[PDB]
Curated annotation (Swiss-Prot):
Record note on what altering residue 140 to H does: In mut1.3; shifts fluorescence lifetime from 3.03 to 2.78 ns. In mut1.5; shifts fluorescence lifetime from 3.03 to 2.72 ns. In mut1.27; shifts fluorescence lifetime from 3.03 to 2.85 ns
Outcome after substituting residue 123 to V: In EBFP2.0; shifts the excitation and emission spectra to shorter wavelengths and increases quantum yields compared to BFP
Self-association and partners: Monomer.
Source organism: Aequorea victoria (Water jellyfish)
Uses in industry and biotechnology: Green fluorescent protein has been engineered to produce a vast number of variously colored mutants, fusion proteins, and biosensors. Further generation of mutants led to more stable proteins (at 37 degrees Celsius for example) with brighter fluorescence and longer fluorescence lifetimes.
Tissue: Photocytes.
Name of protein: Green fluorescent protein
Effect on the protein of changing residue 63 to N: In R10-3; matures to the red-emitting state with excitation and emission maxima at 555 and 585 nm, respectively
Lineage of origin: Eukaryota, Metazoa, Cnidaria, Hydrozoa, Hydroidolina
Gene3D superfamilies cross-referenced by the UniProt entry: Green fluorescent protein
Keyword Transmembrane helix: no
Gene Ontology biological process terms from the UniProt entry: bioluminescence; generation of precursor metabolites and energy
Result, substituting residue 166 to L: In R10-3; matures to the red-emitting state with excitation and emission maxima at 555 and 585 nm, respectively
Result of changing residue 67 to A: Increases fluorescence at warmer temperatures such as 37 degrees Celsius. In GFPmut 3; highly fluorescent mutant when excited at 488 nm
Length: 224
């Protein structure tokens, strides 16, 4: 079914257009995914200059179809079942004591490449907060993404809390509320409650002078 499109390495393109408090920026990413291992390897570049928010705050927005679903849980993989026509992911990301991002992403194949096209709008950020003040460490904690079915919208929802490390030892919470809805009208898999366990490693390309992020991520379904 759509899962058949993910048995090997798949090239990935990510394109993001953003506006946070009137700071306009764009990000382009390239890399590949291998759902057999739940593995993503991507490099993202800010093509407009300096990124006006910290890179870690964009990780969740910057392809859950690459999650490794164990064989015994394959009937719960909504993301691949929506392919190749794709799905639309919408999120509200609420930064505790600060502003919010609202995002819309279309995830679909363009020929044999998996594309994630994103619009991000951020409002009500504090000039001197952890986000616009760039007070977040360049690292990333492991988290669970809790998925539930939304049968009346033929899709899924997700809820989860990201904890961003602040440079003083504290934590910036980012509450995520997510909806995913198929683009096509073929049948999709509507899962039982489960989660995705995600681990992410952020690094820099030593030969790259543009503002950028190298990401290695592993995503594995569990909870059934
Ligand atoms: Mg207002």
């Amino acid at each position: 079914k759509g899962e058949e499109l993910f048995t090997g390495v798949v090239p990935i393109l990510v394109e993001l257009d953003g506006d946070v408090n009137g700071h306009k920026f764009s990000v382009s990413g390239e890399g590949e995914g291998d759902a057999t291992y739940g593995k993503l390897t991507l490099k993202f570049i800010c093509t407009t200059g300096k990124l006006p928010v910290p890179w870690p705050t964009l990780v969740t927005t910057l392809v859950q179809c690459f999650s490794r679903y164990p064989d015994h849980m394959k009937q719960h993989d909504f993301f691949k079942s929506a392919m190749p026509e794709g799905y639309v992911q919408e999120r509200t990301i609420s930064f505790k004591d600060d502003g919010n991002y609202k995002t819309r992403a279309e995830v679909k194949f363009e020929g044999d490449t998996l594309v994630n096209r994103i619009e991000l709008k951020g409002i009500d950020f504090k000039e001197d907060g952890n986000i616009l003040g760039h007070k977040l460490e360049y690292n990333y904690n492991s988290h669970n993404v809790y998925i539930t079915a939304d049968k009346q919208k033929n899709g899924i929802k997700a809820n989860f809390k990201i904890r961003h490390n602040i440079e003083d030892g504290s934590v910036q919470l980012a509450d995520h509320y997510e909806q995913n809805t198929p683009i096509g009208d073929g049948p999709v898999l509507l899962p039982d409650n489960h989660y995705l366990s995600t681990q992410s490693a952020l690094s820099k390309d030593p030969n790259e002078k543009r503002d950028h992020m190298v990401l290695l991520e592993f995503v594995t379904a569990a909870g059934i």
